[model samples]
Target: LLKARQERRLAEINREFLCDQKYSDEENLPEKLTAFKEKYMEFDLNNEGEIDLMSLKRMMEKLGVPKTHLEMKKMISEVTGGVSDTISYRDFVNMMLGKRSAVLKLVMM
Candidate 1:
């Protein structure tokens, strides 16, 4: 399906973004997880326990990784498979750790 193909491309793009920014590098593996989680929590506005497209965009900008509006939308869609507009903390963690397969597995489940 074209939709699936587009999603796969977007997911690829998302992975590239993480690699370019070294989000999944081996360095700081132990400390980075906790720190990244803390940042996700901080960005979970309205205490929803999830990060929406806008919140994710803001969080990325604050982290000095500004992206276009469509990019943020694609980022969320990549994790959620277009099922939802918000991404859970678990998915967020996987995304930050460059675990795209895990994120896709979760969406399949």
Candidate 2:
């Protein structure tokens, strides 16, 4: 029940603008996810089938991205269910691109 609700919230969050960026065209969106897939292997170090928090923190640092401690905590708990230090591919994808989904692509004229 809880996870389903959060998933809806996540979908809502993705539907809206993020990072102080406004809404954008939905076309050409799949490439952004493709971009994530391209970099997935480099970030997953242990080959344990998921990327760990330590690696993801390094990813944040390299990308000049910052998150509040609370943000980190919720992502850790929500995605991993508070039992794992690693995040699944789906969770990593959401955290990485959730904000960009609204602003990273084309401007519809």
Candidate 3:
């Protein structure tokens, strides 16, 4: 009985590992967005309408960004001008997409 239980547990672990490997390779943006949204909801501690700079910095850290808060603040300021400390969601998305576009342009050139 113990051996059977151990075998079942190992099978379950292997199945989970294979499932993760398969899903990790898929690049579906909608599915990625859903996962990001879940994580974003967890990080939005104040329940604010949009993520503030602090929240965004934390998320960036999770994604392996090594920049300091001041560095991120400067980047955000440069992207949006000096009017606000917080970047709205739409503007943030556009800024990121714009950066990606710039990279593609460089590759094409």
Candidate 4:
């Protein structure tokens, strides 16, 4: 399911953002992830050492994720167990790394 979602996201990127652009000329995944991390930190309001649903939604909107709070929350719950209402920096880093690995694997395949 994660693989499918990743593929769909890649398709969206290709169709919506990269159709007329060059992938080689684009910012690589690392650069994108770095930006995401910085944005995540900014949205992690309260400095609670983690990001809650509200924080995640705000971050997504700030990053132009095209998803509503409910949608974002659903996705987060699906990706990480629903138990993880707050995403810690460690978990966020792992998630980002895993996503990058998955994307690379798909591209290689």
Candidate 5:
């Protein structure tokens, strides 16, 4: 079940955000995580540490990523595991990593 969800999330990510391919690469993983957090923070309008469905929709639009309402729901469900309507920081990190069970860590030399 996890694998299926992971694959689905990856497919959705690849299909929806067709702008860059190297975002998920291993190079500079820590730097990538920092950038991801920055973007997530920027979109956390209420500073509640969570990006609700509406805020997510606004964030995508602000980033010039065109997606319909139902598409946004699918994305949210993928992140929240159909449990919550908001994406927490952890969920955002995993979504950015393109894997649901990804552990947050810094790549050290």
Candidate 6:
């Protein structure tokens, strides 16, 4: 998660806000998938191609946004949109670059 967020990466735009200009060169979404896959691989610690929930929690905590179990659980629950037991690498990457993704899109942008 920390790796995904640090995609500080937010790192472009013109009258377009620098960010808009930066992404002007963005590959069509499908093409971005390859880079996305590479990005996700970094966090799937076990190389199992899946993300363990605890790792996310630790990353966030290290990033200084630690949450209590219930709070984390609740937020995770909400974010998952009713999905299953753990956060998948695919899902997390989706969120990382999602339209509403990180909430810091503007700043990161």
Instruction: Report RMSD (Å) for each prediction in the order shown.
Output: 14.1, 11.9, 13.7, 14.4, 13.9, 9.8
Give the per-residue lDDT of model 1 (tens digit) for 1-109: 5434434544444455445545555676556555654455556343354678767767776767757888778778887667778887556666666655643233322
Top candidate on lDDT is: 1
What TM-score would each prediction reach against the true structure? 0.49, 0.41, 0.43, 0.46, 0.55, 0.48
- What candidate 2 gets wrong by more than 4 Å, as runs, is 1-33, 42-44, 67-70, 81-83, 93-109
- Show model 4 residue runs off by greater than 4 Å: 1-39, 99-109
Candidate 4 on 1-109: residue-level lDDT in tens? 5434444443444343333432334546546544545544465443454567776666666655666667666666654556676765445544554544422122212
How well does candidate 5 score on lDDT at residue 77? 79
Question: Which lDDT tens digits does candidate 3 get at residues 17-70?
Answer: 335643445456444434433433444432334456776677667766566768
State the displacement of the C-alpha of residue 62, model 6, in Å, after optimal TM-score superposition: 2.4
Q: What is the lDDT, from 0 to 100, of the residue 5 in candidate 6?
A: 44
> Which 10 successive residues of model 2 have the least lDDT summed?
100-109
Poorly placed runs, candidate 6 (over 4 Å): 1-35, 38-48, 102-109
Runs of candidate 3 exceeding 4 Å displacement: 1-46, 96-109
Q: Write the per-residue lDDT of candidate 6 for residues 19-104, one digit (tens) a residue.
A: 34434545564445445555544443433434456755665565566567666565455446658555554455446555665431
Better of 5 and 6 by TM-score: 5
lDDT of each: 0.59, 0.50, 0.48, 0.50, 0.58, 0.47
Q: What is the lDDT of residue 24 in candidate 6?
A: 53
